[PDB]
C-alpha cells in the first residue's frame, strides 16, 4: 500500500484527537493535578535499528528484538544519535518535490520496547498508546500483529490496544519513516530530523469514559460577571445513573459547581446528543487571567454516578480571558494588547528536537525577563508542556497548525489543491481538538508559507465556526487575505514600502489604512535577529505605540538552531548548516536568535528589553513622568532608582516607590541638583527596579531604564603649559618625534604612523592605517553566495567597487615645528581601477605634554556604494585585562542598534569586547564613546570603536567562531562613524538611509596620550 | 542669552609653517557664567594668497540649538553680481530646497535680497561649493546670504520700506543653518532632522581671489 506515499491516508485506527487526559479515579488527585495511575510514561531505554529503507527491514524484527539493534534514550531524534545526518535546508524541500513520493531511500528507524502491563489492566477498561511525537510518519504492532499507521510530526497519535495486550512481556515495534506524504507539508526553515522525539505513554480509561470536554468562559460588560460553560462528551454505554460533575477551584476552595445527566439539547430534527451534556458555572467577580497576571482555577470534570460513585475525572487549568477584535482592535478583557513577541522553534544543540521541562522553564524566564509577553509556535503545535507552563507562567500563545510548503511553485500549489484539503484539514482541526481549553493560546494560525489556497479559506471558516473564542491568523498570500482576521506580514517594514507582485509588503502605517482596510496589523515576524542584527528595531516599537492598530509583533526568532559537533581532541563546538555533510544546504541561516543554542544572550537581546519596557519616561525640568503601558496590573513590585553622574563620577542618586495604575501615569519631582564644579555632561539615569522575586524573576531584577543629558557645562580652561618641547629627526624614510622617553615614527614612503615607543619598548605591532570596510555582517552579505552572487547586496557592492582591494597612495607628507609642537600633514587617496574611492587628509599635533592630536577628514566619491565605515585601525604590541571606557555600554552596540546602551564609565575584561557570534563577522562595537584607555593608552574624543585579539581579516575569512585565534596583541578598529547594522530581513539591503554613510565629506578628530 | 553672547578670546597664536602662516583662534561665547558656544579656528595663508579656514564648534547640549553656526563680516565692496555654484537660483533653506538646483548661478546683488515685508534672515541660498563676489572667491560646502542689510538692522526694522543699505555688503557664510519650518507659524514648527542639536560642528572655507 506505501501508505507513506498517499496523501489520502494520513493514519489508520487512530482514535480521536482531545485535550490532556489521565483518567484520574481520585478527584482529589484530579484537582491537584498530581500524578496518575492510570497514565504511564514508556520513555526510557528502547532498542533501536536504522535501516536505509522499509524494504531493508528484516520481518523477524516484527516477532524478536535484533541482535544488531542497540539500546537508546526515547524521546530522541536518531541524527542526535549519529545514525544518519540532520540536514539544515530553508525553502528547497529536503527531497525531490513530485508529490506525493518520497525518496526510495527511506531512512528508517525500528523501535521496539518489552513491557508488561498492570494485571487489572488486562481485565477491564481500555488500555492506548500514545506517542507525542514521530517524525514523519509510523506503523505500529504489538506482540507481533500490526496496529495501525498515523502522520503529522507535531501532534499525538494514539491507539488502542486492549485487543493486543496480554498477561506478562509484550512487545512494541515501531517502523518510523524519514520521509512521508507529510514531509510536503513540513517544509519549515529548520533541520530536518526523525524519529520518536515527543513523550511515550499508556492510559487506561474505562469502558464508560469521558471521552472530550470543552471549557469555554463569556462575560458581562465590565467583566464582574462570568459563566463558565462545559460541554463533556461520553464513550460507552449510557444509563440513566450516569452524570457529570463540573467543579471550579481557586485553590483549595470551591467556588462553583454544577451537575446533571446526559442528554444534550435538542439541536435538530432528530433529536439532540444524548452522549453529551453541558454544565453551566456562574462566577461573580472572576479572577482574570493575562500575561501580567495568570490567574488560573482548576476545572475538574468527574463522570460519576447519581447515588455518589466515581467512574473518572479529569481536568484543566482554567483562566477566565476574553480575546475579541473590536473596532480594529485586538482585545484582551476589553483593553487592547501591544504584542511583545518572539517566534520560538523547539531546539537543543545536543538533543536536536527533543524538549525538556528544564529548557523549557529557561526560555519562559529569559522571555518573561526581557520583556516579552507573546510566543509564536513556529511553525506547529508544540509539546504539550508549553502550554501548561504559559498557562501558568503567563504567555499569550499563537497556535499554529504544522502546515508549511514553502518549496512548491507556486507557494499554493498544494493548499489551493482540493485533493490535499484532508491532510492539511487533520494538522488544523487536530490541534485544536487538542489546545482549545489553554487559556495561553489566543490565537491559532493556519500554519505557514503556504501561499493563499481555497484549502486555506475553507479551514479558517471550520476555526471561526467551532471555537468563536480565538482570531484566527494566517499570513501566506500576501498576509492579509479572506484566511485571517489580522493583518499579519512578516518583515513589512515601517516606513518603506516593498511592492512585490501580487503579495507586496506595505510600510506597516501604510497597510493599515489601504481603502477599506480595518483590521488591527500584528507582524507574525520581524527584525530578523540572524548575527550581529536588530538594527532598527527601536523604530518599530515608536510606530507600535504610536498607532492603536500597531499591535506589536513576533521578532525571528528566540534560538540559534546551531548543533554541537566535536574536533579530534573531543573539544565541543557549535556547527550549522552543512556541517554534517548534508547538502544541499543554507549554511548559517539556521541561526537567527536573540540568544545562543546553549541560551547565553546575544547583544541584540538588550535591545528588544529595553524597546519592550513596560514603563515610558519623560522628562521636564526637574520632574520624571512614569507612564504604565501595563493593561491590567498596578506597579505593586517596582522601585524607580535615579542616579546623576558627570562624566561617569556619580554625584547624586536616590530612590522612590512607583505607584502606577495600568495606563497610568505618577510624577516624580527630583530634588535640587547642586551644579558640578568641573566642567563636563551632567547624565541622569533612571532604573525601575523589583525588589521582591517573582515566579519568573529574582528579587533586584531591573525591568526598564531610560537616561537624560541634564545641565552641560564646556571646558574653558586652557591646558598647563609644558616646558619641554618635541623634537623633530628627519631622514630619507622617516619622520621621528621625540618627548622625553617618548617616540613616534613616521613612514615618508607609507605616509602612516608606523611606530611609537615608551622608553625602548615598540607599542604597534602594525602601522596606524584608515579603514573603510568591516567583516561583512550576516545583514551585509544576505543570500549571496559564491556560486550564486546578489550584486544588490551590501558586501558585493563593496566587493565589486573595490572596497577590499584598494591601496592607500601617499600624495601628501610633511613635518613642520611649530612654537610648542610638531606638525605631520598627510594626505593619501585609495584608488581601483582607475577610480578614486576615497581621499583622506589628516594632521598629527604632538605636543609638550606628550599629547597627539589626530585630525581626519575624508572625502567618499558620491558614485561609490556608502561605506561601512571611516576610521583608523592598528594592531597594538599590547595585550591587557581590561578595558575602560567612557561611553555607551556595557554591551555591544552600533548605530541603529544603541538605544539599550547607557552613556558611563564601563570596565570589562577583555574578552567581554568581543562577541562570539558562531558565523564570524564585525562586533563589539560600542559607540558614543569620549575616551577609551587600554594598558597605558587613552584615546579621547567622541568615537566608536572595537577591540579584540582578531583582525578584520580573520573574521573575514573565518567560517566558524570555534577556528579563530587569538593574534599577536590586540586589533584596535576606532571609528569617526560606522554604517548601521541592519536587520529588517537578511536577505536584502535593510539599513535605513539615515544610518548610511552617505555625507561625502566626514571629520573626526582624536587625541592619543598615555595615562 | 544668546543674542547678547559676548565672544571671550581663549587663545591667539602665529606659527611659521615651510610654505605659510598658521593662526590658531579659540572663543567662548558666554551668558551670565554660562557658556553657550566655544568656537575653535585655524587660518592658513600660503603663498598662492589663499586662506583656509577651519572651524570647529562645540554647542552647550543644554542650550537651545542655535539658528545657526557661520561667519559674517561686512565686505568694503559693493558689487553688482552674485556668481555660485550651488543650490539655485532662488533663496533656499535646509527644509525647503528641493526646487532648487545645483548649477552655476549669476544673478544681479538686488536677486539676493528677499523684501519679505515683515524683515528677517532671508536670501539663503544652500549647498554652495564656491562663492564669487567682487574680487572674492569662497570655495567650501557651505550656505549663504549676501546683501546691504546686517542681521541687526533686518531684526530692528518692521518693515521693508525703513530698511536702508549700509555702507558695503553684509556677508553671512554658515557651515550650518536651522530649519526654517513653517508646519504653523504660533508653535515651534522646525522638525528635529533640521534643528542644529549635534553639540560638535566641522566646516571649512577658503577665501581667496576670484
Ligand atoms: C530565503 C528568504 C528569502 S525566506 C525567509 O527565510 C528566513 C530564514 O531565517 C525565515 O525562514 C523567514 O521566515 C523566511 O520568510
Ligand atoms: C513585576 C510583575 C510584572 S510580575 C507579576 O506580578 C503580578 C501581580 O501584579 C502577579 O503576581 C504575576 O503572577 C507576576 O508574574
Ligand atoms: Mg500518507
Ligand atoms: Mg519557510
Ligand atoms: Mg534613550
Ligand atoms: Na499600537
Ligand atoms: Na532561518
Ligand atoms: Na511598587
Ligand atoms: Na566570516
Ligand atoms: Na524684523
Redesign the pocket.
Known sequence: RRDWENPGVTQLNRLAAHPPFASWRNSEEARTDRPSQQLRSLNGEWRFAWFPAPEAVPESWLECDLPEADTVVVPSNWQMHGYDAPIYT??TYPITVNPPFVPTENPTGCYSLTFNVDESWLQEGQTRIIFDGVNSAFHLWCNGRWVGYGQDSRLPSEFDLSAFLRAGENRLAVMVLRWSDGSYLEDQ?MWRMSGIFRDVSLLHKPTTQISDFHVATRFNDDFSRAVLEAEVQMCGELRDYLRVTVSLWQGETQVASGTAPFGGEIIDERGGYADRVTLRLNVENPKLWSAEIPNLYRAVVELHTADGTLIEAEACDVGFREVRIENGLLLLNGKPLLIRGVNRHEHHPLHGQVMDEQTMVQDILLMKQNNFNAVRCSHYPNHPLWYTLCDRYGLYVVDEANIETHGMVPMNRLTDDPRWLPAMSERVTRMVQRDRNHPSVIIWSLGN?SGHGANHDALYRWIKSVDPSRPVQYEGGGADTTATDIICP??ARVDEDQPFPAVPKWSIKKWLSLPGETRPLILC?YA?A?GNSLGGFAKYWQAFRQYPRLQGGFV??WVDQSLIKYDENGNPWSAYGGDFGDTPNDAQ?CM?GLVFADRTPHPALTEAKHQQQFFQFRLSGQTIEVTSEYLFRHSDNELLHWMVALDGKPLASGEVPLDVAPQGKQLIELPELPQPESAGQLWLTVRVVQPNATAWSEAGHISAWQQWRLAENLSVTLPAASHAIPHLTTSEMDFCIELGNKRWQFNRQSGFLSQMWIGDKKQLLTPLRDQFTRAPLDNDIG?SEATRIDPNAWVERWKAAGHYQAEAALLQCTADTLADAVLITTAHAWQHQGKTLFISRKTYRIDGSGQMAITVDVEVASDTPHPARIGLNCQLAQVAERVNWLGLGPQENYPDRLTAACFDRWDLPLSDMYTPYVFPSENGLRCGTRELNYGPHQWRGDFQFNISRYSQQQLMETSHRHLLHAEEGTWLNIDGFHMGIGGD???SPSVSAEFQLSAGRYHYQLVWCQK
Request: charged share 30%.
Open positions: 530553508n525553502v526553515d508559507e512578516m518583515y515576524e530578523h540572524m525571528w526568532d541561516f537567527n543570500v530581513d537578511s536577505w
